[PDB]
Design a protein around this motif. Structure first.
Motif, PDB file in Angstrom:
ATOM      1  N   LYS A  95      16.349  20.371  65.670  1.00  0.00           N
ATOM      2  CA  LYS A  95      16.465  18.984  66.120  1.00  0.00           C
ATOM      3  C   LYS A  95      16.015  18.823  67.568  1.00  0.00           C
ATOM      4  O   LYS A  95      15.170  17.977  67.869  1.00  0.00           O
ATOM      5  CB  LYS A  95      17.904  18.488  65.934  1.00  0.00           C
ATOM      6  N   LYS A  96      16.542  19.642  68.480  1.00  0.00           N
ATOM      7  CA  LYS A  96      16.151  19.488  69.884  1.00  0.00           C
ATOM      8  C   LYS A  96      14.652  19.739  70.081  1.00  0.00           C
ATOM      9  O   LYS A  96      13.966  18.973  70.778  1.00  0.00           O
ATOM     10  CB  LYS A  96      16.979  20.432  70.767  1.00  0.00           C
ATOM     11  N   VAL A  97      14.119  20.784  69.445  1.00  0.00           N
ATOM     12  CA  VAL A  97      12.701  21.114  69.609  1.00  0.00           C
ATOM     13  C   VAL A  97      11.808  20.005  69.050  1.00  0.00           C
ATOM     14  O   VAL A  97      10.800  19.636  69.666  1.00  0.00           O
ATOM     15  CB  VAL A  97      12.416  22.488  68.973  1.00  0.00           C
ATOM     16  N   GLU A  98      12.179  19.424  67.901  1.00  0.00           N
ATOM     17  CA  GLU A  98      11.381  18.331  67.342  1.00  0.00           C
ATOM     18  C   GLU A  98      11.373  17.133  68.277  1.00  0.00           C
ATOM     19  O   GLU A  98      10.344  16.462  68.439  1.00  0.00           O
ATOM     20  CB  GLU A  98      11.921  17.918  65.970  1.00  0.00           C
ATOM     21  N   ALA A  99      12.520  16.855  68.909  1.00  0.00           N
ATOM     22  CA  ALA A  99      12.593  15.764  69.869  1.00  0.00           C
ATOM     23  C   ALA A  99      11.656  16.014  71.041  1.00  0.00           C
ATOM     24  O   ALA A  99      10.910  15.116  71.456  1.00  0.00           O
ATOM     25  CB  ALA A  99      14.035  15.585  70.342  1.00  0.00           C
ATOM     26  N   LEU A 100      11.667  17.243  71.581  1.00  0.00           N
ATOM     27  CA  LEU A 100      10.713  17.598  72.633  1.00  0.00           C
ATOM     28  C   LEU A 100       9.271  17.495  72.134  1.00  0.00           C
ATOM     29  O   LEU A 100       8.406  16.938  72.816  1.00  0.00           O
ATOM     30  CB  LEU A 100      11.000  19.005  73.175  1.00  0.00           C
ATOM     31  N   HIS A 144       7.996  15.667  69.767  1.00  0.00           N
ATOM     32  CA  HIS A 144       7.548  14.324  69.412  1.00  0.00           C
ATOM     33  C   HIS A 144       7.727  13.332  70.545  1.00  0.00           C
ATOM     34  O   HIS A 144       7.311  12.175  70.408  1.00  0.00           O
ATOM     35  CB  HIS A 144       8.290  13.805  68.174  1.00  0.00           C
ATOM     36  N   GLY A 145       8.332  13.756  71.651  1.00  0.00           N
ATOM     37  CA  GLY A 145       8.713  12.827  72.702  1.00  0.00           C
ATOM     38  C   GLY A 145       9.652  11.743  72.216  1.00  0.00           C
ATOM     39  O   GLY A 145       9.513  10.580  72.614  1.00  0.00           O
ATOM     40  N   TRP A 146      10.597  12.092  71.346  1.00  0.00           N
ATOM     41  CA  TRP A 146      11.604  11.125  70.930  1.00  0.00           C
ATOM     42  C   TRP A 146      12.439  10.709  72.128  1.00  0.00           C
ATOM     43  O   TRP A 146      12.863  11.553  72.919  1.00  0.00           O
ATOM     44  CB  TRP A 146      12.508  11.712  69.844  1.00  0.00           C
ATOM     45  N   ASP A 147      12.649   9.401  72.279  1.00  0.00           N
ATOM     46  CA  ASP A 147      13.586   8.885  73.275  1.00  0.00           C
ATOM     47  C   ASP A 147      13.260   9.395  74.684  1.00  0.00           C
ATOM     48  O   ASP A 147      14.149   9.783  75.442  1.00  0.00           O
ATOM     49  CB  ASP A 147      15.014   9.250  72.871  1.00  0.00           C
ATOM     50  N   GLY A 148      11.968   9.424  75.025  1.00  0.00           N
ATOM     51  CA  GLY A 148      11.508   9.796  76.352  1.00  0.00           C
ATOM     52  C   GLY A 148      11.560  11.275  76.686  1.00  0.00           C
ATOM     53  O   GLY A 148      11.248  11.642  77.826  1.00  0.00           O
ATOM     54  N   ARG A 149      11.922  12.133  75.736  1.00  0.00           N
ATOM     55  CA  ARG A 149      12.180  13.547  76.013  1.00  0.00           C
ATOM     56  C   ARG A 149      10.905  14.370  76.200  1.00  0.00           C
ATOM     57  O   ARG A 149       9.872  14.101  75.576  1.00  0.00           O
ATOM     58  CB  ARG A 149      13.029  14.144  74.890  1.00  0.00           C
TER      59      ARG A 149
END
Lengths: 33, 33, 33
Positions: free
Chosen positions: A21-26, A28-33
């Motif tokens: 989950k955390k790596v996918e967020a990084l 994809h730039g989810w939520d500015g990440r």
């Protein structure tokens, strides 16, 4: 031993799913990440 | 088999802990990351 | 149980190796990441 392994494996499964989950967020730039 | 599993589990534990550290650094922007 | 653990461990190994690759790409800025 087996019951001990089972417990450690299931801790690793939680950890790995949280990491995915955390790596996918990084990635994809989810939520500015 | 069990001794073999034990060894692989402990390799995974090291790996996962190193990944958590790296991911937290990325998430928090530690040291410019 | 043991055969079940073996299967879950090997899923975790795949997952962790994919995470290491993705994290290294983020850490090194491979391909603009």
């Amino acid at each position: 031993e087996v019951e001990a392994l089972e417990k450690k494996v299931e801790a690793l499964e939680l950890k790995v799913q949280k990491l995915e989950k955390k790596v996918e967020a990084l990635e994809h730039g989810w939520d500015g990440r």
